[PDB]
Design a protein around this motif. Sequence first.
Motif, mmCIF file in Angstrom:
data_model
loop_
_atom_site.group_PDB
_atom_site.id
_atom_site.type_symbol
_atom_site.label_atom_id
_atom_site.label_comp_id
_atom_site.label_asym_id
_atom_site.label_seq_id
_atom_site.Cartn_x
_atom_site.Cartn_y
_atom_site.Cartn_z
ATOM 1 N N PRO A 156 -7.396 7.791 -9.048
ATOM 2 C CA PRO A 156 -8.461 7.853 -10.072
ATOM 3 C C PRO A 156 -8.975 6.731 -10.438
ATOM 4 O O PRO A 156 -8.317 5.640 -10.576
ATOM 5 C CB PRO A 156 -7.964 8.814 -11.021
ATOM 6 N N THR A 194 -4.074 1.850 -12.207
ATOM 7 C CA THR A 194 -3.413 0.832 -11.454
ATOM 8 C C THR A 194 -2.155 1.579 -10.881
ATOM 9 O O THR A 194 -1.082 0.880 -10.737
ATOM 10 C CB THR A 194 -2.948 -0.327 -12.384
ATOM 11 N N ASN A 195 -2.237 2.839 -10.836
ATOM 12 C CA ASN A 195 -1.149 3.828 -10.367
ATOM 13 C C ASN A 195 -1.597 4.422 -9.580
ATOM 14 O O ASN A 195 -2.540 4.939 -9.298
ATOM 15 C CB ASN A 195 -0.867 5.013 -11.514
ATOM 16 N N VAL A 196 -1.232 3.857 -8.026
ATOM 17 C CA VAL A 196 -1.474 4.033 -6.898
ATOM 18 C C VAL A 196 -0.340 4.712 -6.092
ATOM 19 O O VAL A 196 0.755 4.045 -6.340
ATOM 20 C CB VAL A 196 -1.976 2.609 -6.199
ATOM 21 N N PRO A 197 -0.435 5.707 -5.122
ATOM 22 C CA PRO A 197 0.598 6.583 -5.196
ATOM 23 C C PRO A 197 1.452 6.964 -3.639
ATOM 24 O O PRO A 197 0.485 7.511 -3.065
ATOM 25 C CB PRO A 197 0.036 7.984 -5.902
ATOM 26 N N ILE A 198 2.581 6.878 -3.598
ATOM 27 C CA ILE A 198 3.475 7.475 -2.618
ATOM 28 C C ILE A 198 4.928 7.707 -3.458
ATOM 29 O O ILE A 198 5.452 6.559 -4.008
ATOM 30 C CB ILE A 198 3.743 6.623 -1.383
ATOM 31 N N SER A 199 5.329 8.884 -3.409
ATOM 32 C CA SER A 199 6.802 9.110 -3.739
ATOM 33 C C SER A 199 6.926 10.248 -2.854
ATOM 34 O O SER A 199 7.067 11.482 -3.403
ATOM 35 C CB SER A 199 7.308 9.308 -5.122
ATOM 36 N N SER A 245 1.523 -0.013 7.240
ATOM 37 C CA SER A 245 0.397 -0.901 6.983
ATOM 38 C C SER A 245 -0.419 -0.102 5.806
ATOM 39 O O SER A 245 -0.312 1.117 5.689
ATOM 40 C CB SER A 245 -0.347 -0.787 8.275
ATOM 41 N N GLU A 289 -16.910 6.567 0.734
ATOM 42 C CA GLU A 289 -17.175 5.885 1.681
ATOM 43 C C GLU A 289 -16.182 6.497 2.894
ATOM 44 O O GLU A 289 -16.348 6.055 4.089
ATOM 45 C CB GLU A 289 -16.848 4.401 1.930
ATOM 46 N N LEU A 316 -12.486 14.746 7.762
ATOM 47 C CA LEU A 316 -12.296 15.007 9.050
ATOM 48 C C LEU A 316 -11.832 16.518 9.587
ATOM 49 O O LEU A 316 -11.786 16.837 10.545
ATOM 50 C CB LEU A 316 -11.637 14.020 10.002
ATOM 51 N N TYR A 372 -22.942 9.063 1.904
ATOM 52 C CA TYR A 372 -22.939 7.643 2.301
ATOM 53 C C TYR A 372 -23.072 7.395 3.990
ATOM 54 O O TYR A 372 -22.274 8.105 4.584
ATOM 55 C CB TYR A 372 -21.718 6.830 1.889
ATOM 56 N N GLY A 387 -23.210 3.957 5.000
ATOM 57 C CA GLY A 387 -22.573 2.768 5.568
ATOM 58 C C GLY A 387 -21.773 2.774 6.313
ATOM 59 O O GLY A 387 -21.196 3.726 7.062
ATOM 60 N N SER A 388 -21.011 1.574 6.344
ATOM 61 C CA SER A 388 -20.031 1.142 7.253
ATOM 62 C C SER A 388 -18.819 2.054 6.769
ATOM 63 O O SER A 388 -18.287 1.658 5.787
ATOM 64 C CB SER A 388 -19.846 -0.159 7.430
ATOM 65 N N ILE A 389 -18.175 2.944 7.665
ATOM 66 C CA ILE A 389 -17.185 3.654 7.164
ATOM 67 C C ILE A 389 -15.786 3.080 7.505
ATOM 68 O O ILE A 389 -15.724 2.814 8.554
ATOM 69 C CB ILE A 389 -17.246 5.309 7.917
#
Lengths: 26, 7, 58, 942, 50, 50, 50
Positions: free
Chosen positions: G2, G6-11, G24, G32, G36, G46, G48-50
């Motif tokens: 969101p 600064t909370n960016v997530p995998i667990s 990676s 953007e 699929l 959008y 533009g460049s995806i």
Amino acid sequence: DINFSSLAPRHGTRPFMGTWSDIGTS
Amino acid sequence: DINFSSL
Amino acid sequence: MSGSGSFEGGVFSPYLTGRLPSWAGVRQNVMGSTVDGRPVQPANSSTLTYATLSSSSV
Amino acid sequence: MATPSMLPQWAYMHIAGQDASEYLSPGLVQFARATDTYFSLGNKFRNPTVAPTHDVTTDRSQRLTLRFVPVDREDNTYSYKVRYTLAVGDNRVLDMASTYFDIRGVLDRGPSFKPYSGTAYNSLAPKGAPNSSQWEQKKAGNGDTMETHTFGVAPMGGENITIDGLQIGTDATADQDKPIYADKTFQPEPQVGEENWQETESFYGGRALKKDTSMKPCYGSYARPTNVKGGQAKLKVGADGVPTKEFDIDLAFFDTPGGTVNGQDEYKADIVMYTENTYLETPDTHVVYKPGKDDASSEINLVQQSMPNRPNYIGFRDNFIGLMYYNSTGNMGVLAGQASQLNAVVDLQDRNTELSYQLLLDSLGDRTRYFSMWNQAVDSYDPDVRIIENHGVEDELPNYCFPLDGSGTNAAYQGVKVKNGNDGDVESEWENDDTVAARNQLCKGNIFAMEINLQANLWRSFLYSNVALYLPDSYKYTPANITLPTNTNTYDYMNGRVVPPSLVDAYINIGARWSLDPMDNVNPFNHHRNAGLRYRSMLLGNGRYVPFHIQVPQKFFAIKSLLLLPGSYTYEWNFRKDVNMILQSSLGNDLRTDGASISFTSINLYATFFPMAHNTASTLEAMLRNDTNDQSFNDYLSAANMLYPIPANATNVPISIPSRNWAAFRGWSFTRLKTKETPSLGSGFDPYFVYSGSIPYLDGTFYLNHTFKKVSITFDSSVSWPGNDRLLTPNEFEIKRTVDGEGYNVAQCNMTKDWFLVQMLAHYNIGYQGFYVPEGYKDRMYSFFRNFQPMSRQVVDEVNYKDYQAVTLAYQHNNSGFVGYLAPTMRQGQPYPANYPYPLIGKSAVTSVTQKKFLCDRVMWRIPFSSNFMSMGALTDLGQNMLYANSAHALDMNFEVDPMDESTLLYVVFEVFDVVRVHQPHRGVIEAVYLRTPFSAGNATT
Amino acid sequence: RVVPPSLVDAYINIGARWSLDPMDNVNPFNHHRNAGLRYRSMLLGNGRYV
Amino acid sequence: EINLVQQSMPNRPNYIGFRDNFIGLMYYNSTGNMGVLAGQASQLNAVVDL
Amino acid sequence: IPANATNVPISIPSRNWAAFRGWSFTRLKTKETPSLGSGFDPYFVYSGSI
């Protein structure tokens, strides 16, 4: 040339089954 | 890393 | 944090990870304070340098 | 799916099986080989590749990075000494490739610094524009009454002018509409004017400067804001000094002359100006002309000219050259045992580690890839600077400017229509229209315009700034209005000297590729188009005061690629704090005088250890403790490096070497340096080194290889070595032949066939089977082929042209009336025929001579010590005729060089073997033996 | 929309190598000097209807 | 009279053209738009998209 | 992630990790990046460049 013969042992790569492994001093 | 190895 | 509309208080369901929310390393959440008024810290001082991105380091 | 798992199903899908050609049927294996070059099947079969699972990495807690803090440090006055204890634990193997210093500190650059070539303040301004400023004078004044004369512009409209100045705003109804008057501090902004080309008429207001502020042209004028509203006024001097809450701002009102004009008894304002005193400055421009002798405010100090200061880029050298003492006395490094304490580093004064390491990375990657880690970025020039290719400008269409309304000059026109036709321009009878307005603005004929040849002045500008400014100061003169420093190595002197733009103009050597003759002895790595230097400068920042953090590698050949085994070791190295020695400049001005300063706080040593398994690390430890598994390296430029003076204006260098063994001798190389550009190594400080441009000696960026015209070799004092009748000049080499009448010149320049052969056998290694362009890896940055640039031009034949008049710079004119008189100042003169270059093309071409030369930059001449002048082995064939026919012989070499008007050095390199060989027989013990063959130390003492 | 021409002064960060701060969160493949894009644009011609 | 003074500036360059390798012109990595290759009279699909 | 986080997530993955290679990671912008799994996005605005 200007001096550069400061090169490796003139070995070849060690033989394997499945492209790679490590054998050490064998 | 990201690769393909083949004959 | 966030919730109510049909609720009361205190989380549940899919986490947004970042170890212990409001993790030090960069915070806009609460003001800093440098060590004895000397400007050396391994982290942000709570300045807006990430409002539009750019790090800094003296 | 994805259901299969574990080893039998990883050999079924070839994730962890045998290779294709072991699992394929053996008929398809040979079919694939048979059809391979026209129908490959190689991409259809997956080959597994597994990492080794044991005995290649430890599972123990081990760091991959260690930071050794100093154990002792002392700062001197121009050196910094830092010792460490570098420890290698048991079962850890260290490589010295992966060690590097971390140096941090503060760098100051003098006020000479200017990493740009424009001006940052204004810059769209005319260079003659003077600002809006008033002055005091007596133009008919007398006594203590001085006439005050204001020159300026008032750009924004008003509604009224009163005692509160401009009135432009208006308040809403709350007791009528009240006027709002412009604030003194900032409100009549100089960036706000009319938004139309249709006048806003009425009253006007503006800004002005006091006569307390001295005039400086508008072009690089700057005054710091004193308000957060961008006012520039300084605070009034009150009781409590300069701090007050008042600003020094006054109002001066003006109206159009005449009594009929404005009131008969009133002279109400039409113009108002907010006069103010400011902190005016020129932070990056200098006044290049003034009629005056004193800068103040005057009617004649309206006329001033300005030019930006010279671009000067400052930043650390190519690979941090000169930032550590190598090859020095009393500043030698240390690598030693911790118990043994005996140094295992010996640095000689006839070694040139810094140069050597340039040549290594020539050959071991590209030098056109910049790396910001070790600060790699090789000095270079653009070849449209150094060799001027000129072709004129394509400028076959006139280009014009037009007024903003684009309808030129318009005049009044009323409407007319015939009363009833009868044909005639006055006889059909015409009469005024009352449905067509009077005073229509129509323009008869073509719209106003002024021609400019853009293309012409775009190459006039460039050609001046990359060539003319970098001419010697024997073609410059000091303006008649300013004084410059006595010292000629000051920045202020260098940008203060003015060069006529007529010396190099886009109208000489036209249609030729030809470096100028006074630009053959100017270092071409001291210009602002050096893009290695620019990169290094802007990798620190754009201001003088730069706190920095840099990572600086080891370069000494003995320990550069050494694998240091377990043990504790003393490592110590010394770092130079000499500004000249560690900072390159694009003008090469003396930075000590200028005000550069440097200091180090915190130097540490890094190391990176491969995390080898303990079992496998102790098998390799044991093996490299053997006395037949000794680690051996050599200097890349393995040589004895010697300098010999050349006196000023002298034509020969007499070089003589004592009787010496020449067993295992290789060739020679040679290049010419300048004394002032070469620092003396073997000294902690050289107080007479006043240079700081690109040092050719260490950076490998030679440029005087083209002043040699012969060299000759003699052994025994009686035998010419190129005297077994192997050359067309059969007792010497000739490099340049000037006056050729046997057709020995080749390659469309003045360079002999003999020498061309020699320098294509010493590099390409082929010339006996035709000359060809060398392959891409046989030529490199410092290889001969790439930097060999033949060139020619015709000039008038001054004896066989019978109308030849020698006109000097003063009496040459060309672009008469469109360019200044011997100065970068405003235009002067009339349109008139030119008389400067003599035609060499078309009908009426003058009789001409042919001048031919070459440049070789970044190349040392080399002659191999091989009978056939190509080496098919590092230990030459004549190095091995000195194991049976040697006993020591004298070598005398004679050289003929062009005159130079300054002292020069000859750098003769005698190519040897530098064997640096090192052995560890026990833990924390290190030993070495260093030996060289034809030139060696310890050959007359123990 | 117009943008001030004085917001990229042309004398701002002069003598520096440095990307602007509000341009680090802007896609730089959505630029007109994208030379892969303009190649494929003009390999269909200059008209709308291709 | 006032619309003699106006200003104009060109419209921004906008280059439109097909994608980098025709990216997104074929469904990939979709189910319901999944590709097919198979034998006839067997219909055992050898394209399985995830 | 969101906006303003600064909370960016995998667990997440509680898998079996046999034959695992690296990771990676990169950050995108939401508007953007299409879906699929959908056949059409009535929300992808959008180009533009995806």
